[PDB]
Design a protein around this ligand. Structure first.
Ligand SMILES: [Mg+2]
Ligand code: NA
Lengths: 104, 115, 118
């Protein structure tokens, strides 16, 4: 059971909830955590840009990571939203079993 | 087949454990316990996280606390077992992510902190 | 990937992208640190989560602080210079400075992130 976490940055909690709902309804993720009140900073053409966003963490498997990314991207209002995968190298076996059973 | 020794996911220098607690009191207690036992070096809490999932055919949204605990690969199983046993849920989220590099002095403190 | 290759020979490596975790004592400090590493092009972007609670067990007593969880997006080539920059400007003696590897991601986002460090 090869789990991963997918980080995605949403503009607000409404949007993060809509995104999470979509991917969970398509069984591309087992569950989603939303972390509100994120301040993002970027540096474009000589100027620092600050925004207030929501950090999402979506729990899935390597087999589903691409389709998850593609679905999130499609439904996301941004053209090129942050979508990154981190590996899970360990975890509780029963949890990892539920995570994997949950998926399409 | 392929060796990426400076991004070597197979041999972590440290680990970060994600655990979700139902409320802030429980998360502080879970943190206190694993810290006092020297199974993690630091715990970071983010209360008011929202968890979204299907359970029993229905889409839930729950207020929960995101826990981030710092430890080493040698301690990861002991940490997870301790968290799980003390956690009110039977099967809480307990996931471990690899650290492929860390500030030397920090890693020295982390090792010095753990049993 | 976009390589016209047998699926066995596709995606044989991982992105140079990494995420760096650091904790700061307060929002203004976290913002100034982030802005510095960005100005120096040691990260592509920074995400801050203010109003976190950290707990430590130092010298036999549990301690609890309000802190900012920082997550910096960078690459393996820059991870050491980023850490060294954060460390030099951090108020703490031995701040948390940990690199997590990104193993996959949206291609266009990873292209922008790679280009950002140039
Ligand atoms: Mg990577
Ligand atoms: Na989009």
């Amino acid at each position: 059971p090869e789990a991963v976490v997918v980080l995605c940055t949403a503009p607000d909690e409404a949007t993060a909830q809509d995104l999470a709902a979509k991917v969970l309804a398509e069984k591309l993720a087992a569950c989603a955590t939303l972390l509100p009140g994120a301040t993002s900073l970027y540096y474009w053409e000589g100027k620092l840009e600050q925004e207030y966003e929501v950090q999402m963490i979506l729990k899935t498997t390597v087999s589903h990571q691409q389709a998850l990314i593609d679905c999130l991207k499609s439904h996301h209002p941004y053209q090129t939203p942050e979508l990154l995968v981190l590996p899970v190298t360990h975890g509780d076996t029963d949890y990892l079993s539920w995570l994997n059973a949950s998926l399409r």
